[model samples]
Target chain A: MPLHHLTRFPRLEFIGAPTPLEYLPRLSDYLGREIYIKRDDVTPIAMGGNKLRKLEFLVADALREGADTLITAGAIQSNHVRQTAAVAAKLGLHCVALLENPIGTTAENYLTNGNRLLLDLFNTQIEMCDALTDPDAQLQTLATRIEAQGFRPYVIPVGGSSALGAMGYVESALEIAQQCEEVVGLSSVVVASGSAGTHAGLAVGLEHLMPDVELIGVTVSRSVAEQKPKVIALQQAIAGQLALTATADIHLWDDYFAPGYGVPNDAGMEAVKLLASLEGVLLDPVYTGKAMAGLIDGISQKRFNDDGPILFIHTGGAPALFAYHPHV
Target chain B: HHLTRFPRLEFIGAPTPLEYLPRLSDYLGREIYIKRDDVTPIAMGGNKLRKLEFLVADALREGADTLITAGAIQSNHVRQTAAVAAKLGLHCVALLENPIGTTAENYLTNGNRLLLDLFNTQIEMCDALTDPDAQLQTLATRIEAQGFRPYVIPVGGSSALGAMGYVESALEIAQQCEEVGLSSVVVASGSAGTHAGLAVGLEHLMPDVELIGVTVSRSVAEQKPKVIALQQAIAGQLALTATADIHLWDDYFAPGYGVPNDAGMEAVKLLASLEGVLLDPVYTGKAMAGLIDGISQKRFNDDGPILFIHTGGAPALFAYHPHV
Candidate 1:
């Protein structure tokens, strides 16, 4: 299939066009590397972080299917749940949030801030579960409930990356590739990786579409050993789904995750602060900050050809910043 | 509140005009334009700043050094107060009534708390369960006890002067509505100050427009009298003809305040998807939710105009932490 503006296919539109792929001159000089920051962080919703693009397709499909209710699951502060609830509400669909982690025990530190407020504003009805329960079991319960109520419930897989959702990022990667060539061939691309949608999409999209650029997937939680194969699988899945011919040169690096999931390291904190203070750019703890730390470390280690430029995918995590403010 | 006798407040901003959302217009089968108070900017923008500008001016006129205010643990009003006070070089302190501490309320510590610390704000925590008013009242008493006077802003800062901020806003809206061809305004009535003051402001500023208050938290029985009293105080202060009827929309307050209501959440999402605007659950979202229900149910008369005010709580979105 030929490249269609994949953004529209997902039912995403806002004030400005696809966010600008801008050079981070200040950061590039400060970090001692040729650095670039993709502007998805500022995507009008501040809304279309990595997953909104996925939901653009996922939710549109649900809307077209004449679904009246939406059900999704996530950790207590999961960005997916936030976006899912938001998208469902916009479409005037009912939504249920299945949340993991203890609640009503200790209010989340950041719940008083951003997405928490948005979640409440959207009036998300949540079913709280312990992390010990199988996550998929909750989804099954929700789907079963929706079916019994005579509502067609579409259960989007985690991150909505079941080949179809992965195309959202594939199109995004193709856009980035064209942008890199327009600016001058980039040496390497850096991004946070999980669920492998973003990294996989990029790998397949860039391999065939923009062969000159390479991608560095900084594993925020999963390591190269654990995540690279998933990336390879998702890459082929994305390419096959989108019918792309890119031979991706994908690389995954770990060591940025400090403690575990949802935990931010000191370097991650510093990165979050640095972006906001210097560029008026904000990042979240779980993903963007660690990925940034990895990119900075890679630069310090001379990971790229000295003369070549690098593009950092700022797949926005601003909503996540509420509970994860570096300012705190 | 006493400074109404003088006019020294530097009115730096006005109420943002409502824009009839074309998408919502089609959705509702009538014209719907949202009041854009979220656009009001002086120092760290919001509808609360409208209250602060007047309140702070009163404080500065008094030549006070310390500015004290109170609110919930995550009150946008409190955050705006701190930001404005910091900008004015006044010592700022917030008496968070919510007993939740640091780890439980990290956004303040890591987010606004960090900013306040940068601006030299003192974070004083009080256990309200034992003595709710004790900590705030003691601070107020001590401030007055000292020779250097301090302006102790109330919770939500819903004083007459703070109310006057919306008075100016009401006047601004009268002008903007004329430009936009609108004649009615809708707002989330929580803390009741913004709605009450706007109702009051119209008496002096623009008597031709309709002021509709959608209770974000309270009901017709509970909220109307307080709103009327506020409007009465504002009208009396201005000596302006304040005879317009105050109408309260009660259908939107459901699923509890600050807790998610499905309709309200739908409204929040509608605005985000349609206009790229983000609103908090506590305020704008609830109002929008009510407005949406009314539109669907045909509650408003065919006046053909509706203005929704968006009080700024963009930071609140960050606190929710949505994943893809």
Candidate 2:
């Protein structure tokens, strides 16, 4: 890692080390590919997930900007919302979550379980909105309301994907690069393409560092056509933040997302169950499960030419499992 | 840690990080550190993985084809035992005993019960906690009649060998506590293995350090003698000196086991709001509530530093929803 890269950003530390690049020997045998998992779920703070990385930079910016309250928005069972609430509570910042109800179901479990339960625990002010509601407008309205009451509010974009926030994954890419150097034959990296911060940050970060490693984005919420442009823009913006002249093409695979976001498809749930039974790790139906499904299907179709090793970034959302399914 | 040789599997995470709670410490006007057993490397992460590492290794050594354990429906021990059995390619059978006064809804389903299903463990529900060992023995005997070898692990994995996990953890904590005042460490005492092992291990490792077990279910009158006996037996097993001072605090268990109470929920919310540490209703939350009470109520004013062991069971928090 370049010492300059770390010093340039005012980063707050919350992540628990380079979270165990665990070799999934059993899953590798089952899938017929050497598989490794980046255990971002076990990052150990606030029931950790991938969002903690982005929050390291986002929270620092909030404190540096002298903000009294932290405001963010996401889906009801959003890892971002839960983690944002957690980081705010940890730092003594008032947190407000604008939770968008994608399913719009009034099911008691959906309303008061999983991340919703956690939001209440963290004492976050939660406002409900529909799926199509604009979180920026809601955040802005709430920010004005808070400011009128003599408080300074900091609003983070959905999923904390700003170029500044995405720098966390840039650092994660550095960690991955070092991990790859330690364990040889890592051919490609697969990650879920959701809000595009993680996908974009890793793309540009690896572009500057591990240029040979193919960064594949498995779309969970959007098509390849819809997600690629947004992710590339993030990559470009991230490159600009680091003052680097880089043009790295983003690769996205979108074969698995059939029924759209938050809807549990067969392959996704199958992947979830498979990973749980096989590797003893839980993957959320919306994101990492679908990413793993795409990775599974891609392997069957011989998508990756190299037969060495593939790394799947386990962007954690295990808590969301309780909301969707109750296994009997 | 290597003083006693035993066949142990590599399932539990080692030397779990000791995190300092600055804000919570400030709120309580004391120095506090948290040993994060919640981040143990397993299904959903819990303290039971440490015990299962030894228990499962022993089962495999005994040529056991199936592992049978008995506990309450939302048992972290049972959930983790199933996880280890799954990881080690051994079949698991959980005999879940419904606690007295538990509603059918919370007793039969949700939380760890759901994870047991995910792990593909065969489950048998028992009506009474009495003769749970007999229940497990009956199941193991029936399995033997069916021509399958079965290994029975007692409830909460509290066997003499199972207690060694905390003995190992005590070594870990002792290493981390060199700079601190080494006053006392508080842990949730459910089945007494963790409490006994910690007490015994700390006696051998750090004679000056004290172990305070917050009784989550059993009253101090019932829990203290059991803890002392277990601690002595564990010392006998490890060939070490034992301590007679076994402290069990039974003040925080308001509504009994598997039941959520006001103070436990308050502690859960307080920890989550203050430091982002998630605690479940059954164990860590109640233990923390007791610790908070002890802090403000002047139980630890003479003591310099205090540590809390976070035995993970946030999955069980789902079972107690409206209460939370």
Candidate 3:
């Protein structure tokens, strides 16, 4: 009901309907708990992922601003950049992506294939930076240069995680709430926390809609100390935009992401294989795989308070799995 | 409507989108639409999932404990079959043949092959030159000896029962194209189940709309008979007659099967850049190349608006790294 007022903003129809919220029968039997997956991975776009949800709002704003081109930044194999590039192509707008080598992987496919290959195919202008360079500053500099060249550019932040971009997940929270109304006790929702937009947006929306269901964010990049404040600030910003108070408890666990972001780790790989083999669902090495690993560890340690079903958000990046083939 | 008579496991929840390709259409100076089979929600998705819906349902009715199928190592069919088997808790044994002698690491270990491994599918390598049907029968016998009821599916799920998926799809498309006023439907014809099914279904429903098959493997002379045979078989199943003059083109598929051609590469880039849609080097890309060429030469200019069936194979894009 809270999001009914927030629907005044423009949104492109990328998701036709609510993505499937199905129970994981095999996975539940294996882990000794009730498990369900909210499949955000299966949207109608180029190698569908969670980013398309955010891009729906972000790109709508871009079009409203009469922008001729879209400029964004992410890692070399970033799903955000890939989806952004794809949306730009779909709308016939020029796209410039500033990519950085965040994980410092020297694998050939990691460097050239997967999302990177699709980026080339989408004809996105590629701007490369080393690990130490600031991607935001680089994005701004590129935007200014493009402006000087008689092109109007709209800059989207990393992972499309701006306050406007986060509105996508705010809408998604309403979707999840409506879908879970039939279940007796859906106690908690689990999601990967990367750019903080998804976590922040869901936190704000669920606070007004389904306040009983706790939101757990499994960080894929930074520690809890570094990431929790980002989520809180973004949630507060969203709440301020809606003239409400930020009341949702932001719970984040940083135990899974190791050996740096975008690098495939043992626990994440195991989670990827386990989900794929058990339920024929895929999780990417960088984001959802690590988050699922955290969820698996949480289940083992009995982390949640309620004895009800837990929902795992499948923020898809299966295309990136090909980049990490050697590790997988 | 006859498709309802056969038991079908619902893989495609709703109808796949009949999307307009505005940019590509403008660029080519023709009205173009695509049926997005690529977005089917299973194991990265492909056209094979549609066939497997009917094929696997028949297997389930037969009390199949194991589903045995054969394809190339990076076959989208094999990947979807494995994923369906995994989802159904049925054992899957994939007999993969390395037809294209590419030594790329990704080609061997990644893409569809990687998904097959993740699905925990038991893989058996077969000789490329020999009949894979024989190998599938031999493997099914061995699986039966192991005390499992094995149901063997043909390559690409191109059986008469399997083609029922696209016969049903043809009906779906007929309804979708009612307002669009379509004149032609372009599709990739490899193993020919999709082409044959659509040929028969459209012949009955929309007899005026031409179904053009762009060969991905064999020549017009070689592939037309196979397609006609299957079309007749499907027609015979529904007590209908098959068409006589089936339109087919062998221009796009050059070099060999599973090998990427220059025209196909250009087609892949055009669709990717123009429409933000990914087409694999093996199937959709080549078929699109033929479509592009046909449009350029004014072959389809008189065919009103064209509907290209995107029988998905984008997962194979990852395996053929250098080609894309």
Candidate 4:
């Protein structure tokens, strides 16, 4: 039987196929361990990434709830904001993207190069906020303003980290299990933890299906002290949604994101270039590159206690590579 | 397994979706569909990945450590070839032509050039489009002299090995048409790999379905011989008969390559606003503009249904900011 049959949920069919589970033989060889990449980036739509999975269900829910407009927020180069605008364009819905200039850089290209170009191309209504401003408060104000103006706006939180949006990763875990049939006793699954939704959903799903495979989150923003509780709470929320006990063991490693969110550092630059040269896989400096840096460093330090295969979820931000200051 | 008989890289995410363009079809008053090769799992996927898959493997089989290929500044062929080089850990040198009707600024830095830079591909600027082959040979000689094994891919990877990629796609399209009953198919003909490869494959596999090529550069007289020669080579590789009855139109590329034309811009905006799928100014957008014109002129009304090959060049749209 198909795995998707279990948790039957409404989803808009934007993904072209089951994204390939590529074995990174060269990268694995360099690391002196077996490694595999779950290519969520290869999910085919609007220059695909992890956000599309959440939006698959989130957009469906919004349409059911009578949404005429879709609203979301992110930093200047937010993959989530770009993707939301793309979905809105394809579905013929109005899009309002609330972007924050968090980098505090004077470079106009930094603000308007990568996702900015995409947001314009997608014909989205743009709203700007200061780096120090409250994101949630801004989103609420926009939501109310749009509502008053006779538009039904469905506001997606940062990273699409709602309980319903998080369910997509439960589906994603189901995909991983089917692709890697011997899922028991896997060493660990490494993912970039920007928002807690992906971490939470994977924790809940993998806990039930492949409990032995440890779930590790390489934090892209915030420390483990701040990130762990958010993951746990979201896991609890997702558990309530699916009517199951939340028992997935979750670990957040904050060593890689020392320079702060959306700021490119030496470790991430090295990782991005290494992967591009080694495997032809592109990861952004914002998320996956930092996660990969942590994984590569871990392998160097002989951190894995188990001998089983390690899986890295490539959450896909190839477009952002063109925008970054450093060239490979 | 016809494709498996030859050395081929497993770089392409196979079986690109055959999606229905329902909204466009309704507006055009004829059923229409699209073959999406843009979403191939590569560095910003495109149709060229298919060509590079076979071409790269052949390079590796020859014990080549460096791959030499050529294309226009915004070439999908060059970008894809560079990506394949990165994956195989082979050095890539791209011979880019400073094409006519393109800005030197955006032409230098935007679109696929930016990607090639990140892919770590070495670049050499070529003169007009007429001299790339000679330049490619010169680069290959220099590379070999420098103690590196070299393999050369022509403009657009149009060789029989590269065209085999589209032979594989042709088989996929045939299978899809079996499910939906396709009438005709249209594609952009640039350096002629896709148009030639698809023509040969369809002549054998889907003979009843019409294959049309809208020229992005060159006249019908000039493009036909190039396309026919490549088609014959591809057919020879596939052990099939050659057909000279190729349909190509060079009307849409007026005001030169990479420059925006009225009809092309209208067609691009139509698809973007209506279907939300982006098109490239250099290739697919102009090809689609020709396709729309073909429909309006009642050229394809008798064909029953149509399929447009979305060869995926949305990245190039950034270069032509004036048009979009």
* Highest-scoring model, TM-score: 3
Residue-level lDDT of model 2, residues B142-209, one tens digit each, is 88898889998998999888988889998988888777776778999989999998988788778776
Per DockQ, the best of the predicted structures is 3
The single-chain TM-score for chain B of candidate 4 is 0.95
In model 4, which runs have C-alpha deviations exceeding 4 angstroms?
A1-8, A182-185, A305-307, A325-328, B1-4, B100-106, B301-303, B318-324
TM-scores of all candidate predictions against the true structure = 0.62, 0.96, 0.97, 0.94
Candidate 1 residue spans exceeding 4 A from truth: A5-16, A44-48, A102-117, A132-138, A174-185, A305-307, A324-328, B1-30, B34-111, B114-302, B307-311, B316-324
What overall lDDT, based on C-alpha atoms, would model 1 receive against the true structure? 0.67
Candidate 2, A184-241: lDDT as tens digits: 6678899999889999888877887788788899998888899988898888888877
Ranking by DockQ: 3, 2, 4, 1
lDDT per residue for candidate 3 within A34-83, as digits (tens), equals 99998899887998988999999988999999998999999888999999
For residue A281, what is the lDDT in candidate 3? Answer: 90
lDDT, candidate 2, residue B113? 81
Evaluated on CA atoms against the true complex, candidate 1 attains a DockQ of: 0.11
B20-90 in candidate 3: lDDT tens per residue? 89999999888899998888878788888889999999999999999999988999999999999988889
List residue ranges in candidate 3 displaced over 4 A: B301-303
What is the TM-score (0 to 1) of candidate 2? Answer: 0.96
- For model 3 the TM-score comes to 0.97
Q: lDDT per model, in order?
A: 0.67, 0.84, 0.89, 0.82
